[PDB]
């Protein structure tokens, strides 16, 4: 019982925004990925520090709240003011909308940028279940799971065993080409024993 991000987000994840949730002989582990979560946080921050920036233009009074001005000039002031009110109110609602979409789509981008990294790591040693997880076709102890997180997994070390546990019939497993040395071979105990060794005995 374990799932990924194609379905739902984990609520137990609190060291960061993205992480690995694994499962093996020793049990479940939930540990955040630090590089990916900082890359998301540091771009949302980049938005804030661009919109929080202040304006340094100072406007003075042209109206007069205590002592009203000429009806014409006042009406034109009111007309300009209410027209400017409309522009900023529009420019504001839109900016929040765009930046909220770019924010939401920003975090989705960094989840996949991490998923598609772990994919290339495991090379030909795991498969995509389809729900944001990787069925690993080789025994992976708690030390091996941490090798996936800190980008040290070596596909070579487990490749040959993983592909054989993947390309199967019934138990089974593909077999190597018997030596091309000129002598016919027969299969016995997972090794190509030579046929000449079965034709030099005696009859009964």
């Amino acid at each position: 019982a374990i799932a990924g991000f194609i379905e739902n987000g984990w609520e137990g994840l609190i060291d960061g925004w993205y992480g690995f949730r694994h499962q093996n002989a020793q049990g479940e582990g939930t540990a955040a990925d630090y590089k990916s979560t900082q890359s998301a946080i540091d771009q949302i921050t980049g938005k804030l520090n661009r919109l929080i920036e202040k304006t340094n233009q100072q406007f003075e009074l042209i109206d007069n709240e205590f002592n009203e001005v000429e009806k014409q000039i006042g009406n034109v002031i009111n007309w300009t003011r209410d027209s400017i009110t409309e522009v900023w109110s529009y420019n504001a609602e839109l900016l929040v909308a765009m930046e909220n979409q770019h924010t939401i789509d920003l975090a989705d981008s960094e989840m996949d940028k991490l998923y598609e990294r772990v994919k290339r790591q495991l090379r030909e040693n795991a498969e995509e279940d389809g729900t944001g997880c990787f069925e690993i076709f080789h025994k992976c102890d708690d030390d091996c799971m941490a090798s996936i997180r800190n980008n040290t997994y070596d596909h070579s070390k487990y490749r040959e065993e993983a592909m054989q546990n993947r390309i199967q019939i019934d138990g089974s497993g593909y077999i190597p080409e018997a030596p091309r040395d000129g002598q016919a071979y027969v299969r016995k105990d997972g090794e190509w024993v030579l046929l000449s060794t079965f034709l030099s005995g005696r009859l009964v």
Partner: antibody, heavy 127, light 113 residues
Framework: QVQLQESGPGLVKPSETLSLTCTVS????????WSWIRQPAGKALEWIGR???????KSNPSLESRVTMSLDASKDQFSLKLTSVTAADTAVYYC?????????????????????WGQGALVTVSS | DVVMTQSPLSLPVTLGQPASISCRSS???????????LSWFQQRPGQSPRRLIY???NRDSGVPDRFSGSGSRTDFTLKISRVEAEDVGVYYC?????????FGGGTKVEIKR
């Protein structure tokens, strides 16, 4: 009611492993961010790195190649190891602590606060 | 790296007069949680530095009234209402929003008595 006490060699030879250790009085190491700040003789404060229990030795790039931090929860001591030491690493080495709120998910991705400081240890790097 | 620039770099004041210290950051210092993490630090003769102001304006407990922090997002100012003989020392500003923590150059305050 918390105090941080630095300890370690007063001089380390060039290219050695400068080691120091901040011993915590009256608090649990589990509940803080732990920073090492060094101050060379009459220069700006330099922030080395920060760790917290469950691991995450986020460090400054100038020294990351050489820095190594760990902290023991039974002995209550932040520790530090600077490999291949130079005359530039001659400095006062204050250690510092900062509040750690477990639920502040966004707090592990921000430089830790510098709530408490130690007395500072002098490590002069010569032969 | 966020660049903390303080001014002045030597601030000799007259015992009992006010003064200010400006700290300009190369970047905005806002964070997702809505707080901008600038701090002010006072390192007096032969001592560990202690924190006067955290989060631009909040003064730390156990600090004289005359220390009040202020600032926006790039431009910040530490204000001392009334510098007495006990405020001698060096004053730093640090950003605490961006990796890595960085400190200002420092301002040397010396009392004119």
């Amino acid at each position: 009611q918390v105090q941080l006490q630095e300890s370690g060699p007063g001089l380390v030879k060039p290219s050695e492993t400068l080691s120091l250790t901040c011993t915590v009085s009256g608090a649990s190491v589990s509940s803080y961010f732990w920073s090492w700040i060094r101050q060379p003789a009459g220069k700006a404060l330099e922030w080395i790195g920060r760790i917290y229990t469950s691991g995450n030795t986020k460090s400054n790039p100038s020294l990351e190649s050489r820095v190594t931090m760990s902290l023991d929860a039974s002995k209550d001591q932040f520790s530090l190891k600077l490999t291949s030491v130079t005359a530039a690493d001659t400095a006062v080495y204050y250690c510092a602590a900062g509040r750690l709120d477990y639920s502040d998910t966004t707090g592990y991705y921000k430089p830790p606060p510098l709530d408490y400081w130690g007395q500072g240890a002098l490590v002069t790097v010569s032969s | 790296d966020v660049v903390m620039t303080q001014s002045p770099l030597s601030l000799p004041v007259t015992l009992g007069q006010p003064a200010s210290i400006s700290c300009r950051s190369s970047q905005g210092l806002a964070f997702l949680d809505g707080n901008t993490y600038l701090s002010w630090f006072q390192q007096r003769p032969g001592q560990s530095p202690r924190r006067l102001i955290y989060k631009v304006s909040n003064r730390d407990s156990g600090v004289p009234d005359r220390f009040s922090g202020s600032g926006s997002r790039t431009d910040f100012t530490l204000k001392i209402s009334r510098v007495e003989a006990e405020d001698v020392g060096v004053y730093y500003c640090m950003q605490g929003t961006h990796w890595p923590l960085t400190f200002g150059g420092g301002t040397k305050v010396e009392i004119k008595r």
